[PDB]
Design a binder for this molecule. Structure first.
Ligand SMILES: O=c1cc[nH]c(=O)[nH]1
Length: 283
């Protein structure tokens, strides 16, 4: 009774038992994908709590460069320590509203990989880019326009050259926007995990938002909608928008095969979908 986990699966390895195995695999793979998302969200929340406790007189951000600069210098070791110990964080930042602060004020910490150290670098200059330019300044305008904590769907950050997701909390005082605090994750951390997943003979996973927009799929273009690949995928999109169908078997037809999927909502609001041909569940 010394059980060992499964190793390399030989090629060719009841229907109810297969449904149960697929349900558990959906849940465990979602737990794995959630790992770095939870690491980052917990760290951002912790620094946010310190940041707002220290921001004792927000009115001075509009009229005192000394206040902004002193506050920033106090926050630097806190943000740096947190980022350095956040597995999967690629950047960390505290930036301020460009209407009343200097456009490179605040903090921008970067590193290449989890084995390297974070460095404090000049923050991206708000005065150089249009507010609609997601690839340069989206990590400010999208969360602030949302008015709450925001997981950003994947985008190319052109300041660092990486396709990433981000968790950003706007810093507001009495309803007024003061700044943001956030960290980023290289999206390939998640797509690599997707690529390594299988079930049965040819089952695979993919990532989609609640409206059916593709975040990552080995065959479908990023940013396309599932319903535009095959009219049979409207049944999948319907399930994604109905919370009561989470973690239940959903049947559909795609590219000439009956398929079964299970989905689970991830920490960032994406849906992880695990799918297989119906014949692979059959006995
Ligand atoms: O200054 C910053 C902050 C977040 N993200 C960036 O690319 N730059």
């Amino acid at each position: 009774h010394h059980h060992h986990s499964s190793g390399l699966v030989p090629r060719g390895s009841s229907y109810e038992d297969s449904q149960q195995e697929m349900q558990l695999k959906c849940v465990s793979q979602s737990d794995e994908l959630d790992t770095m998302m939870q690491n980052v969200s917990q760290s951002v929340e912790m620094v946010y709590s310190i940041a707002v406790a220290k921001l004792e007189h927000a009115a001075s951000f509009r009229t005192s460069k000394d206040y902004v600069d002193t506050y920033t210098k106090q926050m630097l070791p806190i943000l740096m320590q947190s980022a350095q110990n956040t597995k999967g964080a690629l950047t960390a930042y505290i930036r301020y509203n460009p209407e009343f602060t200097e456009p490179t004020s605040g903090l921008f910490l970067t590193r290449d990989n989890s084995d390297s150290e974070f460095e404090s670098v000049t923050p991206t200059d708000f005065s150089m880019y249009d507010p609609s330019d997601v690839e340069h300044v989206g990590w400010y305008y999208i969360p602030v326009q949302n008015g709450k904590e925001t997981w950003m769907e994947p985008y190319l950050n052109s300041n660092i050259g990486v396709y990433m997701i981000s968790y950003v909390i706007p810093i507001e005082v009495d309803g007024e926007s003061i700044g943001i605090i956030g960290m980023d994750i290289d999206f390939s951390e998640f797509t690599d995990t997707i690529d390594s997943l299988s079930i049965f003979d040819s089952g695979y996973g993919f990532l989609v938002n609640e409206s059916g927009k593709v975040m990552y799929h080995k065959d479908l273009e990023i940013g396309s909608n599932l319903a535009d690949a095959d009219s049979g995928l409207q049944s999948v999109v319907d399930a994604l928008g109905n919370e009561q169908t989470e973690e239940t078997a959903v049947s559909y037809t795609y590219q000439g095969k009956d398929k079964v999927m299970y989905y689970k909502t991830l920490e960032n609001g994406m849906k992880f979908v695990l799918t297989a041909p119906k014949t692979e569940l059959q006995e």
